[PDB]
């Protein structure tokens, strides 16, 4: 019943490649990402208003 006692929290958000490239040093393994296969249409769990 207390948020401060929670062990973990997991969030799903939408980004593009330019957003990740805004801070290049922060992220690794960008070249292995499959941008076609991880579209919002593939993942049903994420709830969004995007067509």
């Amino acid at each position: 019943g207390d948020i401060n006692k929670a062990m973990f929290a997991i969030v799903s958000f939408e980004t593009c490649k330019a957003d990740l490239l805004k801070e290049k040093d922060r992220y690794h393994n960008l070249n292995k990402i499959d941008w076609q296969s991880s579209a919002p249409v593939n993942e049903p769990d994420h709830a969004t208003t995007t067509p």
Binding site: S37, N42, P44
Partner: protein, 50 residues
């Protein structure tokens, strides 16, 4: 993940094929190559192949 991905790809392929067949069946201006006048007449052998 793999099962879900293949399921969704199948869905998109099916819907596109369904649209295409309706487009072909609802054509307004129809031309038959050669001397054919109906789908049964198209023939590849003769004086005038289709």
């Amino acid at each position: 993940e793999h099962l879900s991905r293949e399921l969704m790809n199948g869905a998109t392929q099916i819907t596109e094929a369904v649209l295409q067949k309706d487009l072909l069946a609802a054509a307004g201006t129809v031309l038959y190559a050669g001397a054919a006048t109906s789908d049964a007449t198209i023939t590849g052998e003769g004086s005038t192949p289709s």
